Structure formats: C-alpha cells, structure tokens
Amino acid sequence: SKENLPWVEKYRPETLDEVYGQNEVITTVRKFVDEGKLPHLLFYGPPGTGKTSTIVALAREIYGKNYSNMVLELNASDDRGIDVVRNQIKDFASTRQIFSKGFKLIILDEADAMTNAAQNALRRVIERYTKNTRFCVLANYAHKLTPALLSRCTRFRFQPLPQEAIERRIANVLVHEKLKLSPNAEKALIELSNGDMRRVLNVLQSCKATLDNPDEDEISDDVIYECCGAPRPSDLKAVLKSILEDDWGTAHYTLNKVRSAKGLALIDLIEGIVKILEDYELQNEETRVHLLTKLADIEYSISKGGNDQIQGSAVIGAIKASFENET
Template structure:
C-alpha cells in the first residue's frame, strides 16, 4: 500500500480522502473490475467505461487510480477532465469544456488519449444525455469517457450502448474488514470485537460509511491512545438504534399491556433520540430472525410499510408510534 503524502498535509483530511486508494491494488473487493480494466490498459484497448453501483463502493476511486496507472502520478491531473454531471450546468458548458480539453495537446503525453470522467451521470436530464452521445463519438479519437452513476436504468440506452459496463457490488464484509484493520493500525485506534462487527453490519457494503463511522468514533474517545471504541459508541455515531434497545422495545410490546408498552417505547425514544422510522426498520430486521408463519410475516410487513409511508408523508409521530405498537401486538395476537 502506498500512502505517499506527508503527515502534515494528511493530518486534517477526512479519512475517506486520506485513505482513498492510491493505486488499483488498494481498491478492495472489486477484483473482477480491477483485473479487466487493467487488462484493457495493458492491451492498449481501453473502451469508454461505465461504472455503476451503490455509493461508497469505489467507482470514483477506481477511475482515479486507473488514471494514475495510465499516466503516472505526476501528470495524471493534466490528462483527466472531471465533470460532475449534477452541477448546475447546461450541456453547452459541458460541450465547450470537453471541446477545449480534448483539443489541447499535452507536452508530457505518452498516451494518445485523455480521460474524461463524468461523475453522477444519472443526474443528467435525458436531453443532456442524448446530446452527449454525439460528443462521445466526435472525440473518440483523442479521448475516452468514463461515466459514473449509481443507477444504470437512469441512463439512456444510447449512452449505455457506447460504454463497456461494470457493476460495482456492495463491498463484501471481508473487504471492508481488511481495509478497516489497515486504517485502524495506521490511526492507532482500538475497537472491541463487537464494535468491529457493528461497523461491518452498519456499513452495508459502503466503505465510505465505514471509514466515516470509524473517524467519528475516534473523536468521541477521551484518551484515543488507550481507550477502546465500544459497540455502543459505534451505534451512537451512526445514529442507529442499538440491538439491545430494539429487543427491549419489542419485548415490552409483546409482553406488557398496551399502555405500559407505549410508555416504555416513548421513554426509550426520548432518551435515545430514536426516530420512529429507524425503530421500524430495526424491528423488521429482528423479526427476520423469528420463526413466523408466512401469513403473520406478510401481515406485519404490509402494515408496517403503510406506517412507514405515512411517516414519510408527514404523519403525526404519536399516532404512527401507536400504530407500530398495535400492528405488532395484533399480528402476534397479544
């Protein structure tokens, strides 16, 4: 691993930037993509690329690392044009920028093409995407486009057919675990085993989320050299309900009378600042592990999704909380 920047310049950076992969070897958990794009480069046959997939899985990092590998760490910045498609810019501005970039010569250039990175392309209107297809064709001799997006279905078919597509999967837990160990060692940060498991679970394949949680958890320690980050700290940093609080809520709903259950849930929510929407997703996750008949399970899911919808539409919190308690109690015949 090569983290070449000096301590003083990296000290204040957020960890997601400090630990952004320097080379393709630092991109974890995307072996297929990395191997294939590397092969394209060594064979000198780089096509236009489309990287799509959920946030924090390494799309931007991979293309930047690839650019460094193609052009070298010194000159790569002159050879790439990064455009953020969701900036408030008309297609004319984009067209002009691309034209200017593609038509200037590079003194240091050893490669015959430059790279244009179009980030968040799925945020472009379809008119803008359609205008792009002519641009791509026009400049294919001197440039390669790399389009980055979260959802491929939001891109027009014309754009899709011009690119070789790569899907970035949510990162497997072992990839995040490996990177996490690496970062922890460099930062001299200690986590309990439970806390590590919680980070892996809560990040759901998103490395950016994992790194942000780790950095936030370090900031909570009074003595970062000796103190250990616990599971509770991790849940607090993410703002997610703790499993034991959820289980406690569920038990009171199932075992106590309605008034007591409501009061206990209300108290817990006030003390922990727990949002009702998180309570619902937490319950659903716990109930997945319960053995329930298909009928009971679908009943709970359908009714809880109604409550969730009502909350998103601005429904009254107290009424919706009562509804959650009732849905669970009635489904279990309490």
C-alpha cells in the first residue's frame, strides 16, 4: 500500500540514518540518545529540511514499539489553546511513565501557530516536569515564539539541504523507481530545488509520469524544464543579451518569442535574470540599486495581477535604464 502514496510521503526517512544533509544535528541527537539525556529540543529551518522526519525517527529509536503511548504529537490541526495546554499537555506530563522507565516526549509541531497565551503557560510545564517528560518544538518562523520558550529549549538549526545530500537521495529514489536521470538534469533539479527535498520528489514523480516509457527512456533536462514549466538556461541568457545589447524593438520581440515558444511565465524569467545579474561585476553601485528596487516592484506587481505585456516591457525598461548608469 506504500506504492500508492505520493513520493513525498513514500520516501519519508523511517530511521535516523536516512536523514541526509543535517549531520551536526543528527550526530548530536544520536549522542544524546546513547548517553541517555535528551534536553528540551527546538528544531528550526526552512520547510522540507527534515525536521518532522528527524523528530519522529528519533522518538521511534528512543521508544521502539512504545511510540504510541509515550509520544503526544500536537500540531496546527489541533486546537492548541491555553485550555488544551492546561488540560492535555499538563496531565500527559504529570502522569507516570508507562513501563519505559524513562521520560515521555511531547512533540509540538508548528508551534509558531500557537498563541502567546498558550506559549506562556507551557514554560512552567516544561520547567516543572523536566524529570519525566521532554518537549520538542518544531517551527520555521522563530519570530512567533516567545523569548522564554526560545530560552527553555535547546536550539538546533536545520540548514537548507546541500547538493550532495539531495543527489544521494536522488540516487536512492532512482534505484527504487528504476529510473534514469541525465547528469545535466540532476543539476537543474538541484538548482530549482532551493534546498527542499519535497520539491525533488514532486518534480521527479511528474518527470516519471512525463516519460512515455519509464523503463527505457531517460529524464533529460528538457523533460524537467517542460514538466516544471521553467525557462531553459539558454532562454534566460538570450533574453538578457537582447535587453542589454539590442534595441527597444527587437528585445521586445525576443522576450515575447521566448515567452511564447514554451509558454514561460514572466516571474520565472525575472527570478532567473536576477540570479544571472547577481554574478555581474557592475561598477557603479547605482545600477545594482536601480535593478533591485525596480525588479522587486515589478515582482510585487506581478503577484497582484495586471497587464502582462506592460510588466514585460517594464522589465526591459528597468534593466535598460539601469545599465545606462554603468555606461
């Protein structure tokens, strides 16, 4: 029945040895488990880094078959108010351990969605029952956590997934699905991933679905770019060359031809040209300022709708009028 699951949930790490990327955190929590003392943990990082998998695998290693009766997993799908904090968490922490001779674990996922009233009442619950229960807090926005709750929990930062970890997980996925990935397509997948394994799996599944014969054909860069609808690395430099080297009559034609050959979106081209221009050696310090302050406004206006052609010409104008400073 696990083969009828999405690839994001099908390839969830069941053990702590299947969590890639985060090494200084896994190798610390494993020593915490082996020593026998597990402090109050806080897991922080971008989405899709492996926090909710790491904590569940850690608790599975700690408790084994007693996971169900020794773990209280509460998330944003539950009414984690002050009444729940005082009426469920408190009596789960107060009651004695069920046969494990150790501590209980209370996992508060998406704790950034908890109110300040429910977060200022958990502090003394954490402090009082530290002997027989422990608290793990998972969040991606640390500005919604109260400073005292941030002080009571040991902080572990889940960095964005490096290229090597993403490629080693991609190898396992390819082995399990009997798929093939071109060397030029793995780099594109890693670049579009932005440190998220969920994006890796959700793109690879659609790439497998795109292939006519998933047992003989290979997922090239064309397959990835067509499935995810992203501009090619050549279509992101041809448009920039037209904007920065041609006139105002052919740059528009090149842009509208690139946006019509494969139906590319304006925002993807904007965010690709921004990355391309970030490597430029602009020697005015005002060209960069103008480019950023204008392309950010165009990006903000795109998110609210409006005329597409007007914004497409505005990108050309903002890139052209900025390099006039450099020259």
